[PDB]
Design an enzyme around this catalytic site. Sequence first.
Site, PDB file in Angstrom:
ATOM      1  N   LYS A  44       0.800  -1.178   0.000  1.00  0.00           N
ATOM      2  CA  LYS A  44       0.000   0.000   0.000  1.00  0.00           C
ATOM      3  C   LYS A  44       0.865   1.274   0.000  1.00  0.00           C
ATOM      4  O   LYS A  44       1.757   1.434   0.836  1.00  0.00           O
ATOM      5  CB  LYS A  44      -0.901   0.013   1.233  1.00  0.00           C
ATOM      6  CG  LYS A  44      -1.741   1.287   1.402  1.00  0.00           C
ATOM      7  CD  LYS A  44      -2.764   1.483   0.323  1.00  0.00           C
ATOM      8  CE  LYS A  44      -3.072   2.976   0.220  1.00  0.00           C
ATOM      9  NZ  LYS A  44      -4.373   2.980   0.792  1.00  0.00           N
ATOM     10  N   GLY A  71      -8.308   8.895   0.818  1.00  0.00           N
ATOM     11  CA  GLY A  71      -7.520   9.723   1.696  1.00  0.00           C
ATOM     12  C   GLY A  71      -6.173   9.185   2.063  1.00  0.00           C
ATOM     13  O   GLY A  71      -5.620   9.501   3.126  1.00  0.00           O
ATOM     14  N   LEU A  72      -5.660   8.274   1.278  1.00  0.00           N
ATOM     15  CA  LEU A  72      -4.335   7.651   1.494  1.00  0.00           C
ATOM     16  C   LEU A  72      -4.218   7.008   2.899  1.00  0.00           C
ATOM     17  O   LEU A  72      -3.206   7.248   3.582  1.00  0.00           O
ATOM     18  CB  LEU A  72      -3.235   8.674   1.209  1.00  0.00           C
ATOM     19  CG  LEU A  72      -1.801   8.211   1.012  1.00  0.00           C
ATOM     20  CD1 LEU A  72      -1.740   6.969   0.209  1.00  0.00           C
ATOM     21  CD2 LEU A  72      -0.975   9.368   0.386  1.00  0.00           C
ATOM     22  N   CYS A 131      -0.654  12.003  -7.124  1.00  0.00           N
ATOM     23  CA  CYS A 131      -0.631  12.301  -5.740  1.00  0.00           C
ATOM     24  C   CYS A 131      -0.775  13.847  -5.586  1.00  0.00           C
ATOM     25  O   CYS A 131      -0.140  14.578  -6.237  1.00  0.00           O
ATOM     26  CB  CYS A 131       0.791  11.934  -5.172  1.00  0.00           C
ATOM     27  SG  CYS A 131       0.696  11.882  -3.378  1.00  0.00           S
ATOM     28  N   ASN A 133       0.065  17.428  -3.908  1.00  0.00           N
ATOM     29  CA  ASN A 133       1.166  18.203  -3.359  1.00  0.00           C
ATOM     30  C   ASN A 133       0.482  19.370  -2.602  1.00  0.00           C
ATOM     31  O   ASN A 133      -0.060  19.165  -1.591  1.00  0.00           O
ATOM     32  CB  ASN A 133       2.008  18.661  -4.543  1.00  0.00           C
ATOM     33  CG  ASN A 133       3.333  19.264  -4.189  1.00  0.00           C
ATOM     34  OD1 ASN A 133       3.738  19.339  -3.085  1.00  0.00           O
ATOM     35  ND2 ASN A 133       4.006  19.696  -5.227  1.00  0.00           N
ATOM     36  N   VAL A 194      -2.145   2.914 -15.569  1.00  0.00           N
ATOM     37  CA  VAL A 194      -2.400   4.229 -14.964  1.00  0.00           C
ATOM     38  C   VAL A 194      -3.019   4.096 -13.600  1.00  0.00           C
ATOM     39  O   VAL A 194      -3.593   3.050 -13.221  1.00  0.00           O
ATOM     40  CB  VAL A 194      -3.451   5.068 -15.808  1.00  0.00           C
ATOM     41  CG1 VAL A 194      -2.808   5.381 -17.160  1.00  0.00           C
ATOM     42  CG2 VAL A 194      -4.756   4.326 -16.024  1.00  0.00           C
ATOM     43  N   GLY A 223     -11.709   0.495 -13.141  1.00  0.00           N
ATOM     44  CA  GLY A 223     -12.497  -0.569 -13.673  1.00  0.00           C
ATOM     45  C   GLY A 223     -12.831  -0.440 -15.150  1.00  0.00           C
ATOM     46  O   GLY A 223     -12.066   0.130 -15.923  1.00  0.00           O
TER      47      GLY A 223
END
Lengths: 313, 313
Positions: A44, A71-72, A131, A133, A194, A223
């Site tokens: 992860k 939310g990571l 991601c 920044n 991707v 998907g």
Amino acid sequence: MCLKLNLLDHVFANPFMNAAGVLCSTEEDLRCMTASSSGALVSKSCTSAPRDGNPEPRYMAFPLGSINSMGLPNLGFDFYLKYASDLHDYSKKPLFLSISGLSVEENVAMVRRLAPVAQEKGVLLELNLSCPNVPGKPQVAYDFEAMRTYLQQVSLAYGLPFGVKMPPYFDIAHFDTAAAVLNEFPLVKFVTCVNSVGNGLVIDAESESVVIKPKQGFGGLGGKYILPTALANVNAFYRRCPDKLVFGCGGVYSGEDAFLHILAGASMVQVGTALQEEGPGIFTRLEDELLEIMARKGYRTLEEFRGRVKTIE
Amino acid sequence: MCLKLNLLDHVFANPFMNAAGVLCSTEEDLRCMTASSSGALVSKSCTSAPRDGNPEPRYMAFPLGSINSMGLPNLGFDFYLKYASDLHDYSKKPLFLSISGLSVEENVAMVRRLAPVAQEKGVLLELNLSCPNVPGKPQVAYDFEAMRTYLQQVSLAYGLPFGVKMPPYFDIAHFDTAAAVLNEFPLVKFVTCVNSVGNGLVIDAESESVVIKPKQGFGGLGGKYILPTALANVNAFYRRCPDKLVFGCGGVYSGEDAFLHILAGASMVQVGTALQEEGPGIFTRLEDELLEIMARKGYRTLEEFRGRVKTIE
Ligand SMILES: Cc1cc2nc3c(=O)[nH]c(=O)nc-3n(C[C@H](O)[C@H](O)[C@H](O)COP(=O)(O)O)c2cc1C
Ligand SMILES: Cc1cc2nc3c(=O)[nH]c(=O)nc-3n(C[C@H](O)[C@H](O)[C@H](O)COP(=O)(O)O)c2cc1C
Ligand SMILES: COc1ccccc1CCc1c(C(=O)O)[nH]c(=O)[nH]c1=O
Ligand SMILES: COc1ccccc1CCc1c(C(=O)O)[nH]c(=O)[nH]c1=O
């Protein structure tokens, strides 16, 4: 007839692996992936400190795919570094470790400490550039100056071969610019195309409501929605980065979909939504399905067809 | 119970129309759209001179949607201006004319000639901010400084209310930037979200080939693949542009899909792939279906639910 590959100085029984984020957050998840028939796994995407992520519901799936604004959430870098250093059984399959720092300095901090474990144990770094920044600026890989800065600093800090997880692009000029940035960095040995198709919106007609809580319902799409987008990106980077590997991710539910990825240029093929929905048994199915297409076509190995998509006249 | 509405100082029998490019290139096509049950029609994006477009095959459709690299084939602005000024029957429904010049100057030249026909006959302008690829630069709406130039010059040259056809965005900062550009221009009275999802790639497994000839098989995606992308853009611009109308386009195959677009904020609802595939009969079905869902929910008007998508608290 076989699905074996040998790349990045590792040997893979088949090209299939989880997509970062899916079935890879806890020790239990990583043991499960290791026990599966996949050819590899990726842990992860992590940050320096553990994160709880966003409020639920934050992932939802439907017949044509999924949407998420997780939310990571993750157990923190130190946990995934310990898994890589001490827990993973590298006799079973290779391990990738994904990192997704929320600033260039956070990434640098992590990769400095990953390096010696990569060198000694052979874990392979995947850097997520799809991601955030700074809020109000685009995500890293949609800001080419930021992307370059991240790659320069991580290259210097890490000093070993690594790969990058890219968002999809939609404009030829972006393919051209992005691949030129990547090709500045010799240590970038693989490019995973991707990550999700960003900021889509699923709405439920009965309830007249969005289906996830964060971001007023906006989240990244995976998907069946994204397979032609995924293929385009794999092929665009395969053509533009002849000295790198491309790993394909997006829209894989079947051996056929994997075959298309591989025709487009994919080496490894990652599985997100479909694995989240079906569980790790998917991998024996995908392997069987791909082998059956190869048998029908007379292909004995993946290199016989990888990147060999035909164009018209 | 009827779906009639008023926007832009015109009356519409219902919110449905074709998407630019579909069933609108020739006089025959425009007469067919006029005879349909649609509430409006829009003409094929035009250039100053006629264009043949790209080699065939250049459009293909599949259960999940379509891919196209048409190359802006069109009969030229003089033809569509003549259609608007002499041939269209305004008593049947409103007409939009889509312009897609290859430079700002070409757009300015067309809009200066359209202005008096707009004044006299009430034709509406939709300015397409998508472009054939030029190496070394992005499409206009993905280059915010170029977009601002186009809008400044067209606004000055045209001097009347108009709308703009937008590509999808995938990044929240990009929505914020794009909407701020558009809100600099009071004459931009509607925003159509969205054009095709750019530069996808469909590959046929049996033939191991791409399915369209131009651009090594790359082309814009429509249909089921793009509905959540489309809804997100509709809603993002609906929230950001309170003094403008948003027209939804993308992924409409059913009245429920239209209902989702309107919940997200759409005033008119455009139909591209589904129309290409089913033909103009689709408009009666879509109306019936939308009224049926309204009846089941107790809504008597579109205003009662437009933009009223619910978020989770
Ligand atoms: C629940 C979930 C969590 C995700 N988390 C991450 C992540 O932490 N890092 C990352 O690189 N990609 C992440 N992704 C993206 C996937 O790795 C993958 O790129 C995307 O889902 C597209 O593949 P698919 O069509 O097979 O789902 C996540 C996806 C899902 C569905
Ligand atoms: C064959 C074809 C031609 C198109 N040509 C144009 C065009 O000339 N101008 C334009 O604004 N959009 C054009 N589009 C985009 C559509 O108007 C529409 O934005 C897109 O297909 C997404 O809607 P859909 O999901 O209903 O297909 C074209 C689409 C197709 C499929
Ligand atoms: C805080 O991390 C975010 C936030 C919003 C969008 C994307 C990320 C990065 C992590 C991630 C996420 C996530 O945690 O939302 N989801 C994905 O589909 N892919 C990703 O790479
Ligand atoms: C995305 O628009 C493009 C792409 C390539 C060449 C020309 C255009 C503009 C005309 C157009 C076309 C087209 O004629 O190819 N197809 C679309 O899906 N949308 C359009 O707006």
